[model samples]
Target: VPRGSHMIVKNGEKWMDRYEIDSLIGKGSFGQVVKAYDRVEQEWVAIKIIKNKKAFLNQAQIEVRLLELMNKHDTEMKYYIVHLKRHFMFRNHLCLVFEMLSYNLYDLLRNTNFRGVSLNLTRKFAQQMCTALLFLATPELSIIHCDLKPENILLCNPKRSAIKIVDFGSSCQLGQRIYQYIQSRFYRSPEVLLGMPYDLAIDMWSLGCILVEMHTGEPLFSGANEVDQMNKIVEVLGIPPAHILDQAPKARKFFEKLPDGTWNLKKTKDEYKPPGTRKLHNILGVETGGPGGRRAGESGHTVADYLKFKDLILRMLDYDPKTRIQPYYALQHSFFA
Candidate 1:
């Protein structure tokens, strides 16, 4: 290991005489994940090789701690969370072993050419997502998956619809939040963008954004900057409640209080849309069945079904985190029913 360099993992390299690196699975700012064969278990696994730098190592440790905690609580493996099989220090670079899984949801969408998946398929993913979130919501383990995007959720198998949530690198327990600038841009919640206290509700907001993207094959709030992101959300969901904007310190960057005390969003020249003008139903193309829109399916793609989905997503995307739908009740929403 060297400064500014991740571990120089080599193909067929053996560590501890038990695991052999096969190939690179993926890489990120943290480090690379490699496919490896566990000689002892006689199976394949993904090893997340952390960067050698101290900062990267420290962040990786947080991820390790959260994964271990989540894994212990999910001993039965009923939840749709990825299992951290184990971890080790190979030449000072921390490596995490995860159960081998298939492609991520984003990759699947890319394979679909971003045309989006069928509503039936989207529902399957949504249900499992709610189950995983519910598991994280338990009193003993209130982990907030700071980053909950399609790329972070992987399919268990190519042929099966089953999936698992991965990448706890940015996750933290409630009341123990570390980073204010967490979560990806498109899925970022209002509370986060507004510099307000965040919790598990933030993840719910992301889930709302993600579910729509999963079905539509496009990011619901694709903004170039934080200000743009807020404006984009306002376009579809309407303005945030006055109290929410009033309390947010960062809101001034995106909004101004009118003489009448109502907060008005200040937008760039090309960024103005009357609040709620960008109707979700129109975006979803529920009536016209546009790209990634309604499918002429048997039972699930009807107009009523799309309406149920719209209602549920709206609840999840609620600007006020306090009123955002929780996993328990979200699972019971009519869309799921």
Candidate 2:
């Protein structure tokens, strides 16, 4: 269960006819991830062994199928996401194998002291995630990575700038909806928060949080719970428009108009208070000193140039999931362009 010298199939211990379990690399609610050496292929691979329970096994199955489908794509597109080398069930346990990867973006953000990454680095990271979405948006793939967050994106190696999104347990093919309460809190989209049916654009909203967090070194939405999360979205995004509101009748539990025509937390009418609506330029901590960001004594861009970044974030976080900028569309925008 831990990443050390071995696994149930310990170091030098064989798995099937071609692999040896080396060490545990990571663990999550779904499974234990171990490093393995592929004897025939002579490569290191990570195997995710899902808990031998009904629910997790189902998720594991879906993840494997999704990976297999994705691998059908051209070689160039595989860089946007993790490739599944192969999968096999061992002792009634589901296992997934893939190429080795290094630290995740979450780790990178943690080491940065939460002040955020350099603007250029942040943009590059955003572009990678956008590239992933653009690929997922294709009619053939059309998969929705329902749970998108920093932790899901990983670097292939310490040296390269390339990133790949992993974890498909929460993903779903288009037109095949799944759970309603999906997604991590901070990176969750407004449509998800409102309990509405969602698609690829929801991933864009997650990207909005990703880009901002990379810049600020902290989460864009720091909500205590679903209610608080909704509060955070409203403070910054204001209330949802009527058409968006109509989609989620459950939204009435969290929204309503007061006498002053301001959106308030519904039901209570106890005069809900917002944390303060701050503009992007101030919240993201962009420095106009000449592209070096807000750090003092660093060369940064002019204030006007930085606004392009802000504009991009707003579109990605658009209140209407339909209006949210598509990944390829955002990549072609001035910010990524």
Candidate 3:
């Protein structure tokens, strides 16, 4: 029914009867994501247009396989993930339709002035996210969302706090096979930095980063560059073990030229000090320094106790994939309970 030479048009043609395409909502590297109305169900939807034939083929294959697996497991209650409605070819483009979402977590955070997201709300979101990962990490089918960031999380309604995990362009299934490095640099788990084979644990690491970001209204590690990012992580969580760094040649280069004891917090620059760890303690209302020790200047908890949660975060954020927290165990942590 739909006819056009444009790749976007070609993709939309396939699902012409099911939904009426509206205006464009957003665009990414692969193609544009449009807002559409589902006439059959009288609801709104999001249509992702994958223009490149090569990428489309790959993405379509991955999406179909992953969705089928998730449907079979159906483990979590609050696990909100984008479900495919239909796929079509309009002209040259491959169009994939999905359930529409009101706004992404990134936009919500920006609009909220990084405040008003209570600890209870954050914990609820975290619990749901964990549930999703828990379902995906089963032995039968393991899915790793290589790219997990605020932008990838969507809200069903602007007024409501519910979140739906979206975006699977970088996702991959790792059942028996291992996957190479793939993830956004900022949200990347430490294992990804090490260039080691990874699994669903990477998603847990990203969840940790997102949790901190929600609480802090800023990135957990806003390093100027790759080297700085690694160093900033080290400052707060301490350095990676020598064996872990040595295991991956690519990771070694990131720290090779640094001083002998660059891992030590004492040598870190004042500006590079990780604030999330300290901020977490403060927000949790925990007191710092015991007995005769001087009270924290900021009138809040110190970095020491906060490091416990930080360490849990680091478990997923470890430089070596082998050391990362398995998704199931991460879900069981008291942080969520």
Candidate 4:
């Protein structure tokens, strides 16, 4: 049972019944992730301590429920998401226990100097992520991880290459429409940018952006702000169709009626002119900061064709979220197959 007061517990303290509090691993907007030793299991674990604040505490509770749902799905899911082992209250903070992981993909990328990963290796990562999304997008589950990016995907071990998707702080049920701001800016989807109702397809958009970043060692769309983000996407993908814009709840905030009955820039009231457009061939094939490097197609790396990858990107980055690949169907895409 959780109390109303905040806890000031320290390292080396006993947490719950069978875990020894160890070192703090990481921190987030809601709380801290601590590495712990599970006495009952005789293994390492990660414990999430929800902050004492009302909002964060409530969210942590919700996160635990989602984690449990995902955990219950592992056998059928082929284990793409991190599994929660325990949930309890220690002092006033809500604590969630999870299987230990060595490091996240961001750490892996950092160690490599973000030099970009080989297409073969990146495919495994993408496939696992896609399968995870596929599980969430299933009608039975119907969840959308409102945030999807490299930082939340973890390596199973320091030595092995498997990944476990983590973090559900921004997740919502499909069609729930609760959050207005979500996902890291670079990986944010067009539906989010235009205040359109978003669904699981947004995760596919983020996944597409991440896959490109994994190959290029730089984000495909780097934006200083939402306007810049939209412009960056437009520069590569071109202006979205008027129908897509006019349909969004807040599209008029960024676009307006055009003389030709199509949408054009209503332009910002104060700042920003859209940066304009570019070709996929030109944007993706540069020497540096592009698809940083590539293999000439190995025996096992079937998705290595740059053109196939470009086609997938175009599909995933489509302006109308309706047309984007749903993770459920992206698995069957030629680029993956």
lDDT values, one for every candidate:
0.87, 0.79, 0.65, 0.76
Score residue 135 of candidate 2 by CA lDDT: 85
Ranking by TM-score: 1, 2, 4, 3
Cα deviation at 236, candidate 3, in Å, is 1.4
lDDT tens string, model 4, 19-90? 888888988888788888899889999988888898887777778888777665535674887888888777
Provide the RMSD of all predictions against the true structure, rounded to 1 decimal: 1.8, 3.7, 6.0, 3.3
TM-score of 3: 0.78
Judge candidate 3 against the unseen true structure and give its global Cα lDDT, from 0 to 1: 0.65
- What does candidate 2's lDDT look like per residue over 120-208, in tens digits? 78778887888889889879889999888888888898877789999999889877767767889998888888877788888899889
Q: Which candidate is the best by lDDT?
A: 1
Would you estimate the TM-scores of all the predictions? Answer: 0.95, 0.89, 0.78, 0.89
Which digits, one per residue and each the tens of the lDDT, describe model 3 over residues 199-296? 67778778878877775567777677666766666655566676666565666545553466332323433355552354434433344431123334
User: How displaced is residue 324 in candidate 2, in Å?
Assistant: 0.8
Q: What lDDT score goes with residue 229 in model 4?
A: 81
Q: Rank the candidates by lDDT, best first.
A: 1, 2, 4, 3
User: Candidate 3: where are CA atoms >4 Å away?
Assistant: 1-18, 74-79, 175-181, 257-323
Off by over 4 Å in 4: 1-9, 266-276, 286-304
lDDT-best of 1 and 4: 1
User: Which digits, one per residue and each the tens of the lDDT, describe model 1 over residues 238-301?
Assistant: 8899989889988888888999999887755564689889999988877766444446544567
Counted clashes in each candidate structure: 0, 9, 7, 0
